[PDB]
Amino acid sequence: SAHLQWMVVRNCSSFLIKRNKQTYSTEPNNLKARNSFRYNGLIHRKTVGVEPAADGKGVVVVIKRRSGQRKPATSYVRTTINKNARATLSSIRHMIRKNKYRPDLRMAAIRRASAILRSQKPVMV
Amino acid sequence: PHCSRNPVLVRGIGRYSRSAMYSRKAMYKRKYSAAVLATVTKPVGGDKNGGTRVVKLRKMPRYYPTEDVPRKLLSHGKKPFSQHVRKLRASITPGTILIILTGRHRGKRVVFLKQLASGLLLVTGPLVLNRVPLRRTHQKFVIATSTKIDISNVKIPKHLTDAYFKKKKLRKPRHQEGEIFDTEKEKYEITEQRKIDQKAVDSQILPKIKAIPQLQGYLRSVFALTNGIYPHKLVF
Amino acid sequence: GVDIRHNKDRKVRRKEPKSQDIYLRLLVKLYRFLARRTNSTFNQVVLKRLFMSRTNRPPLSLS
Amino acid sequence: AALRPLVKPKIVKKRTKKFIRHQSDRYVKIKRNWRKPRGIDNRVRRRFKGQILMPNIGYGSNKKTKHMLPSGFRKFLVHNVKELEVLLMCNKSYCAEIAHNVSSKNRKAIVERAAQLAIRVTNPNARL
Amino acid sequence: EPYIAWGYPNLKSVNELIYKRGYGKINKKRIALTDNALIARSLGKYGIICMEDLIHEIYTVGKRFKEANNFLWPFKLSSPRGGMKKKTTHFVEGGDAGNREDQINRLIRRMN
Amino acid sequence: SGRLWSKAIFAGYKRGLRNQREHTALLKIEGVYARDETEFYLGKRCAYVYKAKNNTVTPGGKPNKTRVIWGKVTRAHGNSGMVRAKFRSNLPAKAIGHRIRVMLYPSRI
RNA sequence: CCCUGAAAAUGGAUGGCGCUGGAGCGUCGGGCCCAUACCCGGCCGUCGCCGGCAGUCGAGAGUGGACGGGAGCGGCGGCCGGAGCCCCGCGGACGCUACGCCGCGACGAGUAGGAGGGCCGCUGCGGUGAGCCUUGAAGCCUAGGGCGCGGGCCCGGGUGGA
Ligand SMILES: [Mg+2]
Ligand SMILES: [Mg+2]
Ligand SMILES: [Mg+2]
Ligand SMILES: [Mg+2]
Ligand SMILES: [Mg+2]
Ligand SMILES: [Mg+2]
Ligand SMILES: [Mg+2]
Ligand SMILES: [Mg+2]
Ligand SMILES: [Mg+2]
Ligand SMILES: [Mg+2]
Ligand SMILES: [Mg+2]
């Protein structure tokens, strides 16, 4: 159960970073990096994540399925997107809103997706 | 498109009451009971690419900033400066003689023409007398003396809005790195239109000041303070 | 300067359970929501009772 | 030049000068670190006129403006590139600084990653 | 006697007090009387259902004066502008303590 | 070519007897010695012009040693001229008894 | 009212200077000056409302709504008439570490003493950071930059050598 697990790890985790007047959670499948019940990526049955691709270009989205809850080896389906930004977030937006897959991190994803894509394009001197 | 039909005797209160205006507005007889575009269809542009491309304006944003700022509340006031109410001091009337207190022409006596739409005062000294051209002044930084000359029935050209007197800027055409500083535009150019307009206004006001004796010398003078008099005792 | 006595200013009463029993913490969240979002006074006493100490929640004999 | 924060409100400090401990001046054995004077005759403990002030909660800075760096940001401590990524989503309300302990070669890589992540670094030129 | 100064307010005075510095005790909170519905939410049962009702209920004491006076927060006036010429002696002896007949209206104009 | 400002003397900060509030100063406009005549200067902007060592930039002018502390008149202070005024920074006490100008700035006349 | 009555020791006290059409005395007036007192406003914290937020419910909706004839009107389809389910757009800020976040009111002295909080601090231990570290740790110095009301802390530079 998410809630029971959240009480366990709300203040005791290896991913917890409590620094000056700040808290940050470093679990791999979390958006906004903030320690919160809503955004934690470990305790929820259905979770979403936005990571940079293995190569520099493109982004990767990770979705947790519903059957293999107890089996992390196949509890995440990862796919990569390497198209234009406007196409990406619109494509991303369809993963959450259209599929009703936790329509609360919808913007946290696209906001994170917008950030990572803007990171990969080269800096200007 | 009728007029207000409710004369105002004090700001916020009309002359008449609710019932009085109901009769005045004739509301008794006129009682009424009751009773695009986002996208555009562009052509196909084939061949065999059939299906007209339904293009939509205001395409979705290509990037979102990491956070943003929540919108402000509503104010119901705070109208922009363009539509502010222009208040002019009572002593300031078209034709009075003012004294500039702040700028390069500090202490100079000039005549006051009409007041601009911004509230700025458009005045000119009789440039032959004090070298003060048609130039805006602020009513809070001048002193309105008790001397007035009849500048009624003089034709101030209508094309003298604040935009006309607005300062012009040139920097910078296709230069960002600053290594060749511009040696031009430092000499501000007195445009011919300003020259002829200044002649046009001065040609008709100069006869009006020469009527009253020793007023040109009065305007040729510059106001000053002595170790004697004090402004709080002076009558201007 | 207003003359009042502040010794009774802070009402002393259980505001959250002292224990760290998470299961006990859980239904506290549940019943706190229940009393907040209902007019049922019965919830308030139950929510009030969940805070009180073991000695203040004496075991109730079957008989 | 630098990276602007989300907002730059007018930081207001209720007091700027530090609270120096009573009689820090006269004796060197007494450090400037504050201590509450608990004495029967202690004339600053009694809050006499024209004396050393006390700290008290009245000097608390604004909740919005607490812990603002002089440039619209808040601080965070990192020790290597890994903790920098948790800032990628704040990125406008918090700035990171390299810990004093981080060697040059590690810290050189971090700032590069920091620049490409649009993260404001308090001490970029720290080993160079 | 020496801690107070009291008199008989007039209609203008009672008007000024409740309007300029009138505050209500709603839910044991000092709430400014910025809206009439605040009065009705608490004093509607007694027929006091607008600003003017509170004035009328006070100026001439009504059957429900006690509730109305308790509803009003005590007025927190500024210091009397222009001084008061004494504090420790009675009004009849040139001070301010005690009962002045109706000059309390003057003092009210100087307080708020 | 004109003095263009009335001369004043910095007569001290607003103060009790054993307490002194530095944030407002007591100015003495020369030529006014009663409360009533203070209404003319009652809103005028005042300036304290003083010379320093290191040169400072000057608006519409070249850098020089001239610095200035700006301020404006707040109200008259007590029965005989003696206007009290505020400044952007509290006046340094070394300016006691020196020249303060009131600039004849914004005039209601 | 004033004078006499009326004499102490270092040189001295309406506080001093001085003050006599008053800067003395008695009764009065109008102004003016300021305390951390009072009014308003901003901020900090405490307490109280055992206040609000699980409705992230852009479709969510009830101060009753539902079926299923009843006999009727009020209006649009020539005197018979009756479904509309989102959408040309596929879209709609942040939030809720619930030990969190938000709102409002009042309040704020304090020895002895009691209590709460401390992401104040030291040392050692079980874990935890794919933690830091000879590309320089601890420590020490510093007119360096800062944070926190504070306990204290982070970073720059120098030395240092594990
Ligand atoms: Mg108080
Ligand atoms: Mg107390
Ligand atoms: Mg400080
Ligand atoms: Mg010392
Ligand atoms: Mg004592
Ligand atoms: Mg002693
Ligand atoms: Mg006054
Ligand atoms: Mg007494
Ligand atoms: Mg005698
Ligand atoms: Mg206290
Ligand atoms: Mg070192």
Tab-separated table of C-alpha atoms in Angstrom, chain A residues 1-124:
chain	number	residue	atom	x	y	z
A	1	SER	CA	0.000	0.000	0.000
A	2	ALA	CA	1.247	3.470	-0.891
A	3	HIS	CA	0.065	5.180	2.292
A	4	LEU	CA	1.492	2.543	4.619
A	5	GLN	CA	4.769	2.646	2.710
A	6	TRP	CA	4.757	6.449	2.692
A	7	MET	CA	4.624	6.550	6.487
A	8	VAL	CA	7.587	4.171	6.549
A	9	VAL	CA	9.812	6.205	4.233
A	10	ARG	CA	8.476	9.745	4.644
A	11	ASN	CA	11.474	10.562	6.839
A	12	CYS	CA	13.673	7.432	6.586
A	13	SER	CA	15.070	6.687	3.131
A	14	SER	CA	18.401	6.318	1.402
A	15	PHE	CA	17.144	8.824	-1.184
A	16	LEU	CA	16.315	11.499	1.396
A	17	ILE	CA	18.481	14.617	1.128
A	18	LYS	CA	17.743	16.960	4.041
A	19	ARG	CA	19.950	20.001	3.533
A	20	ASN	CA	19.682	23.635	4.560
A	21	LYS	CA	15.960	24.362	4.982
A	22	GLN	CA	15.429	21.979	2.064
A	23	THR	CA	14.390	18.418	1.335
A	24	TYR	CA	15.040	16.420	-1.827
A	25	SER	CA	14.293	12.837	-2.816
A	26	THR	CA	16.573	10.994	-5.225
A	27	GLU	CA	14.538	7.929	-6.140
A	28	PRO	CA	14.986	7.236	-9.861
A	29	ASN	CA	11.355	7.557	-10.970
A	30	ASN	CA	10.320	10.841	-9.322
A	31	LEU	CA	9.532	14.186	-10.914
A	32	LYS	CA	10.349	17.580	-9.380
A	33	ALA	CA	12.814	15.746	-7.073
A	34	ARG	CA	10.744	16.899	-4.087
A	35	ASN	CA	9.960	14.559	-1.204
A	36	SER	CA	6.188	14.189	-1.271
A	37	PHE	CA	3.561	11.483	-1.188
A	38	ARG	CA	2.097	12.619	-4.514
A	39	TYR	CA	5.383	12.808	-6.424
A	40	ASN	CA	7.275	9.873	-4.908
A	41	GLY	CA	8.007	7.274	-7.553
A	42	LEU	CA	8.375	4.149	-5.427
A	43	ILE	CA	5.182	3.663	-3.404
A	44	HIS	CA	2.572	4.279	-6.108
A	45	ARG	CA	0.923	1.534	-8.130
A	46	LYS	CA	1.059	3.710	-11.264
A	47	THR	CA	4.039	6.041	-11.686
A	48	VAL	CA	5.617	8.085	-14.476
A	49	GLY	CA	9.141	9.385	-15.035
A	50	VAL	CA	11.067	11.574	-17.465
A	51	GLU	CA	14.797	10.870	-17.861
A	52	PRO	CA	17.295	11.867	-20.553
A	53	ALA	CA	17.994	9.272	-23.204
A	54	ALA	CA	21.013	6.980	-23.082
A	55	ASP	CA	22.567	9.097	-25.811
A	56	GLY	CA	22.612	12.877	-25.603
A	57	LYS	CA	19.668	13.399	-27.945
A	58	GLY	CA	16.102	12.444	-27.097
A	59	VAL	CA	14.189	11.780	-23.902
A	60	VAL	CA	12.911	8.625	-22.208
A	61	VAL	CA	9.586	8.113	-20.424
A	62	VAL	CA	9.074	5.267	-17.943
A	63	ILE	CA	5.660	3.877	-16.984
A	64	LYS	CA	4.896	1.359	-14.245
A	65	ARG	CA	2.408	-1.314	-15.270
A	66	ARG	CA	-0.306	-2.779	-13.077
A	67	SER	CA	0.464	-6.510	-12.838
A	68	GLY	CA	4.130	-6.840	-11.894
A	69	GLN	CA	3.840	-4.723	-8.757
A	70	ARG	CA	6.020	-7.143	-6.774
A	71	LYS	CA	8.510	-7.738	-9.615
A	72	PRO	CA	10.741	-4.730	-10.422
A	73	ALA	CA	12.526	-6.622	-13.210
A	74	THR	CA	9.473	-6.015	-15.415
A	75	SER	CA	7.634	-3.316	-13.455
A	76	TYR	CA	8.673	-0.463	-15.774
A	77	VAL	CA	8.235	-0.074	-19.529
A	78	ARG	CA	10.706	2.422	-20.984
A	79	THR	CA	10.518	4.031	-24.423
A	80	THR	CA	12.497	6.857	-26.007
A	81	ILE	CA	11.284	9.895	-27.956
A	82	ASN	CA	13.625	11.790	-30.289
A	83	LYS	CA	11.290	14.134	-32.175
A	84	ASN	CA	10.677	17.883	-32.114
A	85	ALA	CA	9.816	19.398	-28.751
A	86	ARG	CA	6.261	20.514	-29.551
A	87	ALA	CA	5.582	16.996	-30.811
A	88	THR	CA	7.133	15.506	-27.668
A	89	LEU	CA	5.066	17.192	-24.953
A	90	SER	CA	1.897	16.772	-27.001
A	91	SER	CA	2.872	13.111	-27.355
A	92	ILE	CA	3.711	13.043	-23.647
A	93	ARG	CA	0.442	14.786	-22.786
A	94	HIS	CA	-1.420	11.899	-24.401
A	95	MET	CA	0.256	9.346	-22.125
A	96	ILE	CA	-1.221	10.917	-19.002
A	97	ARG	CA	-4.466	12.689	-19.855
A	98	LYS	CA	-5.800	10.371	-22.553
A	99	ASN	CA	-4.867	7.208	-20.656
A	100	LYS	CA	-5.885	8.658	-17.250
A	101	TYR	CA	-2.511	7.393	-15.980
A	102	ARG	CA	-2.302	9.651	-12.921
A	103	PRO	CA	-3.531	12.909	-14.477
A	104	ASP	CA	-1.819	14.897	-11.727
A	105	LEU	CA	1.850	14.764	-12.767
A	106	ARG	CA	0.783	15.697	-16.302
A	107	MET	CA	2.524	19.057	-16.179
A	108	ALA	CA	5.346	17.898	-13.911
A	109	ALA	CA	6.276	15.571	-16.765
A	110	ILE	CA	6.027	18.097	-19.596
A	111	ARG	CA	7.676	20.733	-17.415
A	112	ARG	CA	10.472	18.249	-16.727
A	113	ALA	CA	10.415	17.199	-20.381
A	114	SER	CA	10.719	20.822	-21.485
A	115	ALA	CA	13.699	21.275	-19.168
A	116	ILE	CA	15.660	18.211	-20.277
A	117	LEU	CA	15.134	18.941	-23.968
A	118	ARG	CA	16.323	22.504	-23.428
A	119	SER	CA	19.364	21.027	-21.696
A	120	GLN	CA	20.465	18.919	-24.672
A	121	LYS	CA	20.452	21.697	-27.263
A	122	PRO	CA	23.909	23.291	-27.318
A	123	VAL	CA	24.689	26.371	-25.272
A	124	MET	CA	25.415	29.682	-26.991
